């Protein structure tokens, strides 16, 4: 830990968790290939228990980065293609609008306006199949972004079939294991019990409720040392050894559509460096997108960011492949995001 790191850290964060009134934090700079841990804080207020690097957090939105790299690695493995129709991994799905409608389309939010949640009565498979055969698409597909967890989180499902294995098993045996990220998981065991952090909303201790894709879209928790493993395996793909899992993590970072300077990848979204900060520092943002033909393989030369929030949680994940250098930050209260990509970036900037 130099003292470099440690004081704009200490410098950015500190006010950070006053002013927004976090009860717990959990911080990681990769800096050079080397993760820097920091911690501030409540992850139970009620039983006093500090974050620590152990200390689960709910990731959110940042789980659809899994997702897309998993999507990644299945296009890869030759299992599923991005230009393949939704219909041909889902027969049932007979309706006609859709037509036209790829596994990009889903992977991207340009399916035509797909809702940004599954509603909470969608339960069994054939409750899902009747949910999206009845869907009215607003716009034609590839046309206009509008980020849905229904569109994301059916990407994942369907992009696991050909595998034969759940999405949970698939991820787990294709992602997490290779990666050594024996402490992120879709459902927490018991055995993890003490570590997982609470939520605080309104004051009122949360977990995420279960609901329908909601492994695909927002169902991931970890630690902040898992995470940081994460950050630095999207920093330097041609480093791992898995095939597949290398190839899959440079499609994720492909930038597909291009809204303004935002770029969107599988799960991850991008920018190129430098970055204005203002383009990065509303409950429906429909925007229209311009195709990149073909799309720009992982620039490295790139902002690449995603933020995540549950009921009780916020995060945010931002890392810069040219520099080597990236931040993991993990809260137990959901706050606002441009606080968390201005702290981002003072410290990013600071160490750039
Ligand atoms: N709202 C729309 C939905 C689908 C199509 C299409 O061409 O498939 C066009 C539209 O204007
Ligand atoms: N291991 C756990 C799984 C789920 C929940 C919950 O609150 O839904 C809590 C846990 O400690
Ligand atoms: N005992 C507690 C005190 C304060 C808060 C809070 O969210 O500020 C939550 C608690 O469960
Ligand atoms: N309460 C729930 C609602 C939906 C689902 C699902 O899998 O769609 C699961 C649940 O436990
Ligand atoms: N062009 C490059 C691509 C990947 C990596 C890496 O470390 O994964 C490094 C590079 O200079
Ligand atoms: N590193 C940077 C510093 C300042 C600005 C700016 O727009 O003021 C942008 C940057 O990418
Ligand atoms: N200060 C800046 C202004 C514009 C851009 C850009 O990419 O358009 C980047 C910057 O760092
Ligand atoms: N997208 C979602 C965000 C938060 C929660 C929650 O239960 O806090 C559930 C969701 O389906």
Request: no cysteine.
């Given at each position: 830990a130099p003292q470099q790191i440690n004081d704009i850290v200490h410098r950015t964060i500190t006010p950070l968790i006053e002013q927004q009134k976090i009860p717990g934090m959990a911080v990681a700079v990769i800096y050079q290939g080397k993760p820097y841990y920091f911690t501030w804080g409540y992850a139970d207020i009620a039983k006093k228990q500090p974050?620590?690097?152990?200390?689960?957090?709910?990731?959110?939105?940042?789980?659809?980065?899994?997702?897309?790299?998993?999507?990644?690695?299945?296009?890869?493995?030759?299992?599923?293609?991005?230009?393949?129709?939704?219909?041909?991994?889902?027969?049932?799905?007979?309706?006609k609008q859709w037509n036209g409608i790829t596994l990009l389309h889903l992977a991207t939010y340009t399916a035509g306006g797909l809702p940004l949640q599954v509603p909470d009565e969608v339960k069994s498979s054939s409750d899902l199949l009747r949910f999206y055969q009845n869907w009215q698409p607003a716009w034609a597909p590839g046309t206009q972004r509008l980020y849905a967890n229904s569109s994301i989180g059916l990407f994942g499902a369907?992009?696991?079939?050909?595998?034969?294995?759940?999405?949970?098993?698939?991820?787990?045996?294709?992602?997490?294991?290779?990666?050594?990220?024996?402490?992120?998981?879709?459902?927490?065991?018991?055995?993890?019990?003490?570590?997982?952090?609470?939520?605080?909303?309104?004051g009122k201790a949360v977990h995420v409720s279960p609901g329908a894709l909601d492994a695909e879209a927002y169902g991931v928790k970890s630690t902040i040392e898992d995470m940081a493993?994460?950050?630095?395996?999207?920093?330097?793909?041609?480093?791992?050894?898995?095939?597949?899992?290398?190839?899959?993590?440079?499609?994720?970072?492909?930038?597909?559509?291009?809204?303004?300077?935002?770029?969107?990848?599988?799960?991850?979204?991008?920018?190129?460096?430098?970055?204005?900060?203002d383009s990065?520092?509303?409950?429906?943002?429909?925007?229209?997108?311009?195709?990149?033909?073909?799309?720009?393989?992982?620039?490295?030369?790139?902002?690449?960011?995603?933020?995540?929030?549950?009921?009780?949680?916020?995060?945010?994940?931002?890392?810069?492949?040219?520099?080597?250098?990236?931040?993991?930050?993990?809260a137990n209260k959901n706050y606002p995001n441009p606080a968390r990509v201005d702290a981002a970036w003072q410290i990013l900037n600071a160490l750039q």
């Open positions: 974050v620590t690097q152990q200390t689960l957090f709910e990731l959110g939105s940042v789980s659809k980065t899994f997702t897309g790299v998993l999507g990644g690695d299945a296009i890869a493995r030759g299992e599923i293609k991005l230009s393949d129709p939704t219909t041909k991994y889902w027969p049932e799905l007979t309706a369907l992009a696991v079939k050909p595998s034969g294995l759940s999405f949970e098993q698939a991820m787990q045996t294709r992602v997490f294991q290779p990666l050594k990220l024996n402490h992120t998981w879709i459902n927490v065991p018991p055995a993890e019990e003490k570590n997982y952090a609470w939520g605080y909303r309104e493993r994460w950050v630095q395996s999207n920093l330097k793909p041609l480093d791992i050894n898995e095939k597949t899992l290398q190839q899959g993590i440079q499609l994720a970072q492909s930038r597909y559509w291009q809204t303004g300077d935002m770029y969107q990848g599988l799960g991850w979204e991008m920018l190129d460096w430098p970055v204005n900060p990065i520092i509303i409950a429906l943002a429909a925007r229209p997108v311009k195709a990149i033909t073909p799309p720009t393989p992982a620039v490295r030369a790139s902002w690449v960011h995603k933020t995540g929030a549950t009921g009780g949680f916020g995060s945010y994940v931002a890392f810069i492949p040219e520099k080597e250098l990236g931040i993991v930050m993990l």
